[PDB]
Design a protein around this ligand. Structure first.
Ligand code: FE
Length: 328
């Protein structure tokens, strides 16, 4: 019996084969299918051409719509003060000194993890809109990118389609610079994007600074929704939202057990406590954003199985869910 994972980048593939390689000796075994975009994975998965992929809540949302109707099989666990939780916080990071508040955000540059991802988009944009900041009336008259491209001087937003302003700060080969897996894509990419000065703001996770710049953590602060700017380590108070962990998405069939089995074991032999050269998660550390969050976030510490009961909606929450919807 084999599970076929869908990978979305070469390096992600490798890590994948890696684990398949040192796993081929079990009841359930791996195999890596590499697609172009997560969409194609979602699709293959539904077509029986694959069986799993771990997605950001923004994509989990997507993966749940019809025709797919994929379910969140397992969700990532993250360090909490209280040991652990299945959620993370969305924060907007900023360099220390550059005075400026949430309100003074117009005509700025900004870096985002990618189009429609929780932290780098859904939360921030919808927030900005829910605040009278961004002018958006609706789908049937104006796109969202457009309202976005109208608010910021320019941006980096991997996945962007409708506006070159949004692809303005993306560093890399122009062919692929705004690719969904571009060098400036992902939590860490959006950080570099900030690091490198290509944007005045980064929309990332509460772990973001530590994982790329624990050394120069002092060099950054957080933009709070109230007006303040707090210290990188104050995400709790200075946050824009608390979102659901990324989840592993799979067809609603009988296989969901083979997958959980596979994951349960693998995580057993290669967790944060593994003693192997091979790590399922991370580990976290200043590395090249390109090699980050492969398969799973570098910041995941465990996997917690999801109750069969939950679909995408129940998983995300009626609130977040409506919020995402209302944006498309
Ligand atoms: Fe995320």
């Amino acid at each position: 019996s084999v599970i076929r994972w869908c990978t979305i980048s070469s390096p992600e593939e490798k890590k994948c084969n890696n684990l398949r390689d040192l796993t081929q000796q079990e009841r359930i075994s791996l195999t890596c299918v590499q697609k172009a975009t997560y969409l194609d994975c979602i699709k293959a998965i539904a077509n029986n051409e694959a069986d799993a992929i771990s997605l950001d809540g923004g994509q989990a949302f997507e993966a749940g719509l019809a025709p797919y109707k994929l379910k969140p099989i397992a969700a990532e666990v993250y360090e909490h003060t209280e040991g652990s939780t299945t959620s993370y916080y969305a924060v907007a990071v900023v360099k220390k000194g550059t005075e400026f508040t949430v309100n003074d955000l117009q005509g700025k540059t900004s870096c985002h993890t990618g189009l429609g991802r929780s932290a780098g988009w859904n939360i921030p944009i919808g927030t900005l809109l829910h605040r009278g900041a961004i002018e958006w009336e609706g789908i049937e008259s104006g796109s969202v990118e457009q309202a976005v491209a109208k608010f910021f001087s320019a941006s980096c937003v991997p996945g962007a389609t409708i506006e070159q302003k949004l692809c303005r700060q993306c560093k890399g080969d122009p062919k692929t610079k705004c690719a969904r897996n571009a060098p400036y894509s992902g939590y860490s990419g959006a950080f570099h994007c900030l690091k490198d000065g290509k944007g005045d703001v980064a929309f990332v996770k509460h772990t973001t600074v530590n994982e790329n710049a624990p050394d120069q953590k002092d060099e950054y602060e957080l933009l709070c929704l109230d007006g303040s700017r707090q210290p990188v380590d104050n995400y709790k108070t200075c946050n824009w939202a608390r979102v659901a962990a990324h989840a592993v998405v799979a067809r609603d069939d009988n296989k969901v057990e083979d997958i959980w089995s596979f994951l349960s074991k693998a995580q057993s032999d290669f967790g944060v406590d593994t003693k192997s050269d091979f790590h399922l998660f991370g580990p976290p550390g200043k590395k090249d954003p390109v090699l980050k969050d492969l398969l799973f976030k570098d910041s995941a510490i465990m996997l917690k199985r999801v109750p069969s009961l939950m679909d995408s909606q129940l998983y995300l929450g009626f609130e977040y869910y409506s919020a995402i919807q209302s944006m498309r």
